[PDB]
Design a binder for this molecule. Structure first.
Ligand SMILES: COc1ccc(CN)cc1O
Length: 330
């Protein structure tokens, strides 16, 4: 089997991407944030505290003839930005782009943090990291991908995120028309439950490539590119007037600037992030100070190749017995 679904930016800055997902019978379609940095499929629901729902579409398990309470199961998750959610668990039928999993754990939110409430466009998350990170207790549950894997034509999914445009998540096949050149594959460590890999270095603009190992995670659920302070300082030093602002919470730059590209290595291959991809717009409405898309990972404890990086590539998440990651230009 295979599946193919379009993923769409939630706003003009590509702050996140949503993908329609069918849950239950008859189908209830919710727009979920596919997140290769976490492993819970959770949704706003009829159980979510009313004051914490503001415009989201909810899953109502009582209206699904295939929903079953997973007795005694609860979940609770915190994300790297300090946001959180928790609740109980149903199993139900879940389909993405024509690919169907029966008995998928659908984690129903009873509580969500304010950041989730405030994002009316995101109805929940669909985790695509390794199932060892799944938070359901006392019986850990599998991701949608893990459940689907044995049925797929090939045990892979691909992320093809657009810049200010829709893109695609495919399951079970590699669309050879979706990228240019070849796909370069690189080793993955699953020891922390992430799609963790080591970039071979970087360049700023038309500058020389610096060969240096940068361990980080491929994370579709994180907006920006978080890299070591040395690398980030070298990038922003090429932008007149750019500075790290403790009050704003990262590097900012004059909105009048033309940003240089940023290149990262994948083995002997190179992925080029155009300068425009690194512009996240005014820090507040009407400001001439703009927020940067490349930020320091110093306070995070891990480097994160988020959407800023991934959207510059066609990315293969290879879930073979020994997982790997592939990157192509596009
Ligand atoms: C508040 O919204 C989010 C917070 C965290 C993640 C996961 N990195 C995804 C989101 O949509």
């Amino acid at each position: 089997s295979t599946g193919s679904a379009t993923t769409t930016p939630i706003d003009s800055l590509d702050d996140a991407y949503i993908t329609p997902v069918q849950i239950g019978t008859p189908a209830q379609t919710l727009n979920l944030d596919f997140d290769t940095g976490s492993s819970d499929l959770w949704v706003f629901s009829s159980e979510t505290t009313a004051s914490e729902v503001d415009g989201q579409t909810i899953y109502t398990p009582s209206k699904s003839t295939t929903a079953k309470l997973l007795s005694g199961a609860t979940w609770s998750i915190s994300y790297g930005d300090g946001s959180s959610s928790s609740g109980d668990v149903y199993t139900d039928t879940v389909s993405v782009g024509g690919l169907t999993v029966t008995g998928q754990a659908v984690e129903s939110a009873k509580k969500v943090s304010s950041s989730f409430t405030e994002d009316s466009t995101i109805d929940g998350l669909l985790g695509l990291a390794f199932s060892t990170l799944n938070t359901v207790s006392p019986t850990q549950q599998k991701t949608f991908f893990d459940n689907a894997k044995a049925s797929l034509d090939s045990p892979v999914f691909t992320a093809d995120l657009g810049y200010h445009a829709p893109g695609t998540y495919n399951f079970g096949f590699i669309d050879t028309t979706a990228y240019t050149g070849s796909i370069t594959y690189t080793a993955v460590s699953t020891k922390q439950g992430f799609w963790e890999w080591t970039s071979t270095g970087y360049a700023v603009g038309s500058g020389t490539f610096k060969s240096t190992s940068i361990d980080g995670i491929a994370d579709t659920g994180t907006t920006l590119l978080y890299l070591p302070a040395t690398v980030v300082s070298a990038y922003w030093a090429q932008v007149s007037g750019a500075k790290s602002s403790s009050s704003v919470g990262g590097y900012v730059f004059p909105c009048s600037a033309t940003l240089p590209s940023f290149t990262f290595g994948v083995g002997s291959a190179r992925i080029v992030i155009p300068g425009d991809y690194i512009d996240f717009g005014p820090i507040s409405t009407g400001s001439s100070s703009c927020f940067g898309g490349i930020q320091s990972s110093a306070g995070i404890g891990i480097n994160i190749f988020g959407d800023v990086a991934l959207k510059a590539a066609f990315v293969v998440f290879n879930g073979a017995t020994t997982p790997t990651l592939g990157f192509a230009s596009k």
